[PDB]
From Swiss-Prot:
Top-rank taxon, per record: Eukaryota
Lineage of producing organism: Eukaryota, Metazoa, Chordata, Craniata, Vertebrata
Name the record gives this protein: Chitinase-3-like protein 1
Subunit structure: Monomer.
Residue ranges occupied by any GH18 domain in the UniProt entry: 1-361
Family the entry assigns: Belongs to the glycosyl hydrolase 18 family.
Annotated tissue distribution: Detected in mammary gland.
């Protein structure tokens, strides 16, 4: 099994214990750590944070302890956005400048591969993405001739049917990618007006839950479209999503006025780290969605959909039963990386629960 784990470069800045640098990562926890995100500047791959050269080195030092560990650099992300990626990929000359830039940058900085995180290609982009992936892979092939182990190529792909059909020729891109991380944790958000879970494994039968907005549906679709199981990695979140409730109702379909209040550490409305959520559960009422197989919790006017040790193990058992390549984790700096929040003196509780299932059998 692969266990693909993202480390975000902006986590460093969080206050107090929310601060996460790459030396916090257990070298043996994941098979592959992906550093998020790289820029494109002058049509070439580039650093993002002022100190990314230092933190790339911190990350790459982890291989001293675990020489089998692989690292990738993820280019794109949401601040980068779509339109910038579109401009690069749709023209022969900028595409080539970018693709040429990648192997030398990665080798300089100690990375084993590239992760493409274009969030997200429009309908006019689907064919360019195909070309980009094929051509990037071919440049990696060529570059292996010089005697170092071929660079890995991966891609982060959204899990909604609509975004998949719009942007991605899955049958073609799966031929050239070494794995595809399926983003099976954005099925609900504050744009909806009611509470709901963003990472359910199956449909909720009570709600008239659009048949597609669940991990199983997404995995089955990707397979149906031609992604080989042995390339497909299923995403599992260590964050949860929060909502502010519009009434005393807490139940399936309960109305919301907006995203939840920001976390003490993550300081972003609508999202909490798992460490934050362990704190939130003190004095919260907990519930599980039985059909969807994922928990939520509530306290005052706040309502939080999240994943716990039991739900992440459950998702790991599912992906193994479907003979998937493994799991992806968004993100290491959102699990209880310190180990001190969740009453168990155990660093990376969610990620290690996933790991221990994937090792079992
Ligand atoms: C990324 O590259 C763009 C385009 O060159 C540049 O304008 C921007 O400052 C860069 N972003 C960061 C954060 O480095």
């Amino acid at each position: 099994y692969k266990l693909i784990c993202y480390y975000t470069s902006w986590s460093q800045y969080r206050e107090g214990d929310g601060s996460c640098f790459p030396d916090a990562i257990d070298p043996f926890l994941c098979t592959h750590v992906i550093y998020s995100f790289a820029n494109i500047s002058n049509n070439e791959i580039d650093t993002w944070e002022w100190n990314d050269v230092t933190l790339y080195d911190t990350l790459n030092t982890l291989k001293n302890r675990n020489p089998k560990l692989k690292t990738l650099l993820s280019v794109g992300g949401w601040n980068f956005g779509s339109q910038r990626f579109s401009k690069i990929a749709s023209k022969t000359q900028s595409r080539r400048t970018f693709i040429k830039s990648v192997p030398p940058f990665l080798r300089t900085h100690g990375f084993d591969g590239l992760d493409l995180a274009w969030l997200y290609p429009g309908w006019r982009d689907k064919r360019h993405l195909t070309t980009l992936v094929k051509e990037m892979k071919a440049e990696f092939v060529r570059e292996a001739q010089a005697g170092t182990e071929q660079l890995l190529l991966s891609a982060a792909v959204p899990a909604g049917k609509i975004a998949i059909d719009r942007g991605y020729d899955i049958a073609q891109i799966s031929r050239h990618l070494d794995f595809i991380s399926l983003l099976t944790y954005d099925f609900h958000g504050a744009w909806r007006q009611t509470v709901g879970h963003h990472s359910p494994l199956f449909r909720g039968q009570e709600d008239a839950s659009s048949r597609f907005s669940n991990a199983d549906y997404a995995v089955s679709y990707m397979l149906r479209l031609g992604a080989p199981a042995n390339k497909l990695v299923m995403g599992i979140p260590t964050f949860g999503k929060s909502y502010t409730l519009a009434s005393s109702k807490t139940d399936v379909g309960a109305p919301i006025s907006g995203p939840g209040i920001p976390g003490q550490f993550t300081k972003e409305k609508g999202i909490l780290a798992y460490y934050e959520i362990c704190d939130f559960l003190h004095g919260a009422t907990t519930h599980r969605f039985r059909d969807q197989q994922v928990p939520y919790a509530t306290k005052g006017n706040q309502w939080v959909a999240y994943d716990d040790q039991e739900s992440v193990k459950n998702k790991a058992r599912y992906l193994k039963n479907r003979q998937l390549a493994g799991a992806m984790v968004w993100a290491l700096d959102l699990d209880d990386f310190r180990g001190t929040f969740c009453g168990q003196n155990l660093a990376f509780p969610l990620t290690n629960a996933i790991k221990d299932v994937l090792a079992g059998v």
